[PDB]
Structure formats: C-alpha cells, structure tokens
Amino acid sequence: KVYVELQELVMDEKNQELRWMEAARWVQLEENLGENGAWGRPHLSHLTFWSLLELRRVFTKGTVLLDLQETSLAGVANQLLDRFIFEDQIRPQDREELLRALLLKHSHAGELEALGGVKPAVLTRSGDPSQPLLPQHSSLETQLFCEQLEKIPPDSEATLVLVGRADFLEQPVLGFVRLQEAAELEAVELPVPIRFLFVLLGPEAPHIDYTQLGRAAATLMSERVFRIDAYMAQSRGELLHSLEGFLDCSLVLPPTDAPSEQALLSLVPVQRELLRRRYQSSPAKPD
Amino acid sequence: QMEEPAAHDTEATATDYHTTSHPGTHKVYVELQELVMDEKNQELRWMEAARWVQLEENLGENGAWGRPHLSHLTFWSLLELRRVFTKGTVLLDLQETSLAGVANQLLDRFIFEDQIRPQDREELLRALLLKHSHAGELEALGGVKPAVLTRSHSSLETQLFCEQILEKIPPDSEATLVLVGRADFLEQPVLGFVRLQEAAELEAVELPVPIRFLFVLLGPEAPHIDYTQLGRAAATLMSERVFRIDAYMAQSRGELLHSLEGFLDCSLVLPPTDAPSEQALLSLVPVQRELLRRRYQ
C-alpha cells in the first residue's frame, strides 16, 4: 500500500494569492480535507462516471515521462512542459504561465488556519487569478465525511496528483511522470519519496470537475494492479491497457428512487467476480 | 425519379407536432429481447433475455429465470449508450398499432437520418419482423444460441444469477421493449427510440402490459460494444423514474439526451476494490443517498 496525495490549484482569501493546497490523500483509503481544516473520516473511494470518462479521454492522448531522470519539482515541471509543447498539448506561449503555476507554493492542512481559507481558482492568461465562470458544486466527499499516516509503510513511495484550472488552454491535458529514482519534493510534506506524478491541467468545460478528475486519478494510482503496471510500464500503451482493465472491472450504480440494502447486497457476487477478473492478470493476489 | 434529395436538418415546424396532452404517470415494465438462433430449425428469432419490474431478472440457459437483482451497469455500456443516443433516431408520439408499422416508420427515419443505407433496409425489416418467442417456448425449441444478422461466452448476469410477474406489475403500467441485435452489414451502431402516441398491444410481441416505448439497438462487431449490456443499460435507463418521466414528456432528442446526462450525473462507479464485498457495497449507501437527495424531490 502506498501514499497518494491530491493537491488543487486554489487561491486563499486573506491575500487572494493562488497556491497549491492538498484536497485529499490516500493510504489505501481516501481521506478528505474540510473547510474547517481537519481531515474527514477514511472511506472507500467512489467515482463519478464523468470523472472516469474524462480521465480515460485525457489519458488516451496523455503525455507520459517514464523513467525520468529528475529529482526536483522544477526539473519535472520543465521536462513535462517541454514534452507538452512537443506533443502539441499546450502552446509555447502557455509555458511561462504553466511553469509559474506548477512551481507555486504547495500548502497543507497545517497552514489552512494560518490563512483565511481557500477558494476555487482559475489560472488566467496574465499573472492574476480569476474566479470560475461555471457554477460551483460542493464536493460530495466533503459534505458526507468531513462535516464532523502511521499506516504508511516504511519502504513505500508516494504519488503526487496536481489538478488545476487554466482558461488559456484549448483542451484538458494529462501529464504522467515516473521518476527513475524516487525523490522527496518540496510539494509533499510527509517524509515519503515520490515516484509518480499526475498533472491534470485544462480549462473550464462541462462534465469535467477537476477535483473529481484528480480523485479518479488518485484512486487509479491507489489500485494495486494499476500501480504494479505503472512500475513496469514502458510506454503509454501499457498504462492505457491497465486503465482499460480498471474500467472493465468497475461497477456502475445507476440512480434509483427506492434504494435498499437487500437489493444492493445482491451485487456482492458481481463485485467478487469483477475483483477476481481484475486480479487474474496481475502478478499480485487480492488482500 | 432522377432527383435524389438529401435530408434537410430543419426543425422550423417541429413545434407544430408537439401535442398539448399532459402524459399520465405510468409504472414501467421493461423486457430485453436478443436476436438468436435455435438448433431445431436454424431460424432467426427474437428471444426474451431479461425483464425489469422492480429489480432485474435474467433468463438462464435452462429456460428458467434467475434471482432478482439490482441492475448494475458496465462503464462501457453507458459510454456507448451515450454515444449512440447522441446520434439517435427518435419517433415521439408515433401513431402505430403494430410492430410492422413501428418498424417501417423507424426504418424510414433511419434512412432519412442516414443511419443505415437503403440496401440495409429490407434485411433490417426482415430481422425486426421475425418471431418474438418467450421463455415458455424455450424448452420446446431445444435451446437457443446467439446469432449475428447477415445480409443474405456466457454473460455475467447469467453466470452469477441464473446457474442455480402479473402479481408484481402495477395495474396502470405500460411496457418498454428493448430490441438488441448484431448486424455485420451495418457501418455503425444505430439506436432507435420510439414513444407511441398511445400504448398498444402488439400482436407480434405479446407482453403482460401494452407497449409504449421501443428501444432498437443494432450494429456491427465493434470494440467495447456488448449489445446485451447496451440493452441492459437502456432497460435500466427506462426503469428509472426521472428518465421515464422525461421520456414520457420528451418532444425532441435533446430532452432525452439531457435526461440521460442527468442520469449519468447521478450514477456512481465502484472501482475494483480489495475490501470485503459487504463493506464495499454498503459504503455506497450514504454516498448514493447524498447523490440522489435532490433528484427525486
């Protein structure tokens, strides 16, 4: 089991300065950070349909930097932006703004009360942050679990997931990085080296909630089959195949007007069969 | 004649056909039928595969219905259902009383919308007007195997629920028929959605309740397209109250697409998790309750 941290590009209220603030963390269970400043109860990760659809869409044409010889957030950011421009994911005029955004201060829960709280933020063409234009949706996880680290193994490696909204982008863009040597970065406070980096940038678009996109990416990284495939991935095709299997073994629950546990517990064999299908291909065995 | 006009995408007089009758509230019975071949005669026929009353029952390969279960969907089923519904062909308030009339009007609209070629129409009409057999006749037919329509592994639900009606159906209930088949001569998958002007007892397809809606899902073998799962997704869509209300009140394809997108907004995905099954399922109860808090208000 590994540690996955999700940070969202947000702006504070006391200075109106945009920075990175952690929104959720995974050590095989998901925890979320509330507006009060404390972590909610741990819970199993549940994903929206649109988050997984968009994650697949941005992954299929995603920019992958496997076995990258970088040991700094600045170096990873520079290499990722160069490969973004190389693959026509972004434009060369966007590089300066995206580099300024990626290297911003990464804040954590211990300084949320030191600030005046954080607000959703969109990175604008200039050096100033704007406010989102689309209607806001308060996170389901924060409403359900928040309104109320010793399990990290000593020989584990971390994953950092960065989600940000920048209106000066034609399309959402996914950047996946696997470092050659797991290194500790200034972004992550916990003394665990980072092996993987997820970077999700894009403009405001319908059916795309970047917090849920980062939740889907972090849940994918927290899955053992995909993580083992990600360590062994030599190309974007293998990661895509692992994502396809992850979606193959997913279970979609439609809305209903009369939910009951007796009907829901009838899906126990389906969940068991999907888990068995997921683990039949991996070297690992279900825990 | 010499002229071969192209379809004109115009809805300038669409509101001239929007009825002023407020639709009534009906509970739904959904039946999924699949295009199959029987070993006794090698005859193509439509066979009942699953039905929806309150839960889902699937028909096993013994002619007996399986355990009732909650309707789970695959991710690919909903993705491809949205894809084919975006380009879907709709016939809303269709004044037909036979399956032949519905099929002919649907194929005419298919050709008008360039969904199928004019050389596909006769074979599709033959397929849609085949015999619709039901579970009682399965023993007399000596089994049934899936078939693919030509121009000339077992399913998860059966594996997990089938290996081992009129009392339940509410009185003022109308039927939804979902027809699913594979046609190797089609270029792309096509969706047909039909809401009849009034419910009808089609002599071609006898059902416990009159048919109001028809789902037609045909297409070739394409990746990530399981037509049985696509039919199950359409049936679960019709079984849900909000989409059913919108489908009764829909006047264009856009309203149906908006309802389907809201349905997907309120859909929750459980990833493959290593947790025990009962805890993994029961973790979905408060999340789904908070997600559906405003949908049914």
CB–CB contact A49 B269 (8 Å): yes
- Name residues 57-116 of chain A within 8 A of B (Cβ): none
Cα–Cα distance between B189 and B221 in angstroms, integer?
9
Chain A residues in contact with B79 (beta carbon < 8 A): 53
Cα–Cα distance between A136 and A158 in angstroms, integer?
30
Chain A residue whose CA is closest to B297: A257
Cα–Cα distance between B224 and A270 in angstroms, integer?
19
The region, left, alpha or beta by phi > 0 then psi within -120 to 50, assigned to residue B295 is alpha
CB–CB contact A253 B68 (8 Å): no
Instruction: Let me know how long chain B is.
Output: 297
Report helix, strand and coil shares of chain B as percent, to nearest 5: 30, 25, 45
Give me B276's structure tokens: 């025990």
Helix/strand number for chain B, H first, E second: 9, 11
Q: Which fold has domain B14-292?
A: Mannitol-specific EII; Chain A (3.40.930)
Helical spans, DSSP H, in B129-240: 156-161, 227-239
Cα–Cα distance between A65 and A243 in angstroms, integer?
17
DSSP one-letter string for B215-273? EEEEE---TT--HHHHHHHHHHHHHSHHHHHHHHH--SHHHHHHHHHHHHHT-EEE---
Chain breaks in chain A (C to N over 2.5 A) after: 148
DSSP character for B23? Answer: P
Instruction: Name the residue type at position B175.
Output: A
Where b means 16+ CB within 10 Å and e means fewer, A85-98 reads beeebbeeebeebb
Element (H, E) at B43: none
Mutate to test the interface with B, among A28, A256, A268, A282 (most CBs of B within 10 A): A256
Give yes or no for a contact between B56 and B71, defined as CB atoms under 8 angstroms apart.
yes
- Angstrom CA distances, A48 to A6, A24, A27, A139, B201, stand at 17, 16, 20, 11, 39
DSSP character for A151? Answer: T
- Name residues 157-186 of chain B within 8 A of A (Cβ): 159-161
Element (H, E) at B51: strand B44-52
- Name residues 266-285 of chain B within 8 A of A (Cβ): 266-275, 277-285
C-beta atoms surrounding B265 within 10 Å: 15
Chain A residues in contact with B71 (beta carbon < 8 A): 254
Give me A23's structure tokens: 């929104």
Cα–Cα distance between A143 and A5 in angstroms, integer?
20
CA dihedral of residues A250, A254, A259, A261 (deg, nearest 10) = -10
Cα–Cα distance between B1 and A146 in angstroms, integer?
71
Give me A101's structure tokens: 């955004």
Chain A residues in contact with B75 (beta carbon < 8 A): 49, 52, 247-248, 250, 252
Instruction: Name the residue type at position B88.
Output: G
- Angstrom CA distances, B79 to A61, B26, B154, B192, stand at 18, 28, 22, 17
Element (H, E) at B186: none
Chain A residue whose CA is closest to B80: A53
CA angle (A132 as vertex; A126, A135 as ends), nearest 5: 165
Tell me, rounded to whole angstroms, the distance of Cα A191 from its chain centroid. Answer: 19
CB–CB contact A252 B75 (8 Å): yes
Nearest to A266 by CA among B241, B58, B87, B150: B58
Cα–Cα distance between A275 and B79 in angstroms, integer?
21
DSSP one-letter string for B65-133? B---B---B-HHHHHHHHHHHHT-EEEEEE---SHHHHHHHHHHHHHHTTSS-TTTHHHHHHHHTS-EE
Give me A24's structure tokens: 């959720």
Contacts of B46 (CB under 8 A, 6+ apart): B33, B34, B35, B36, B130, B131, B132, B133, B179, B205
Nearest to B56 by CA among B143, B178, B221: B178
Nearest to B286 by CA among A151, A4, A40: A40
CA angle (A139 as vertex; A136, A141 as ends), nearest 5: 175
CB–CB contact B270 A46 (8 Å): yes
CB–CB contact A257 B296 (8 Å): yes
Give yes or no for a contact between A48 and A37, defined as CB atoms under 8 angstroms apart.
no
Chain A residues in contact with B242 (beta carbon < 8 A): 255
Four-residue CA torsion sign, A69, A75, A77, A78: negative
Nearest to B47 by CA among B115, B140, B163: B140
Chain A residue whose CA is closest to B239: A256
Give me A154's structure tokens: 């000593």
Long-range Cβ contact pairs of A24-31 (< 8 A, separation 24 or more) = A24/A141, A24/A214, A24/A215, A24/A218, A26/A218, A26/A219, A26/A221, A26/A222, A27/A1, A27/A2, A27/A3, A27/A149, A27/A151, A27/A152, A28/A1, A28/A151, A28/A222, A28/B274, A30/A141, A30/A215, A30/A218, A30/A219, A30/A222, A31/A145
Give yes or no for a contact between B165 and B53, defined as CB atoms under 8 angstroms apart.
yes
Element (H, E) at A14: none
CA distance between the termini of chain A: 11
Give me A245's structure tokens: 């299997």
Cα–Cα distance between A69 and A50 in angstroms, integer?
34
Q: Does domain A1-275 have CATH number 3.40.930.10?
A: yes
Cα–Cα distance between A15 and B285 in angstroms, integer?
40
Judge whether B265 is closer than 8 Å to chain A, CB to CB: yes
Question: In sequence order, what are the beta bridge partners of B59?
Answer: B65
Nearest to B134 by CA among B33, B1, B28, B2: B33
DSSP one-letter string for A171-234? S-EEEEEEEEEEE--SS--SS--EEEEEEEEE---TT--HHHHHHHHHHHHHSHHHHHHHHS--
Judge whether B131 is closer than 8 Å to chain A, CB to CB: no
Pairing mode, strands A3-12 and A18-27: antiparallel
Chain A residue whose CA is closest to B73: A252
CB–CB contact B273 A44 (8 Å): yes
- Name residues 223-262 of chain B within 8 A of A (Cβ): 236-237, 240-242, 261
- Name residues 183-222 of chain A within 8 A of B (Cβ): 207, 219-220
CA atoms within 13 A on the CB side of B217: 27
DSSP character for B14? Answer: G
CA distance between the termini of chain B: 56
Instruction: Name the residue type at position B118.
Output: P
Chain A residue whose CA is closest to B158: A270
Nearest to B231 by CA among B100, B101, B46, B11: B46
Chain B residues in contact with A224 (beta carbon < 8 A): 274
Where b means 16+ CB within 10 Å and e means fewer, A106-123 reads bbbeeebeebeebeebbb
Judge whether B52 is closer than 8 Å to chain A, CB to CB: no
CB–CB contact B278 A259 (8 Å): no
Question: Experimentally, how was this structure solved?
Answer: cryo-EM
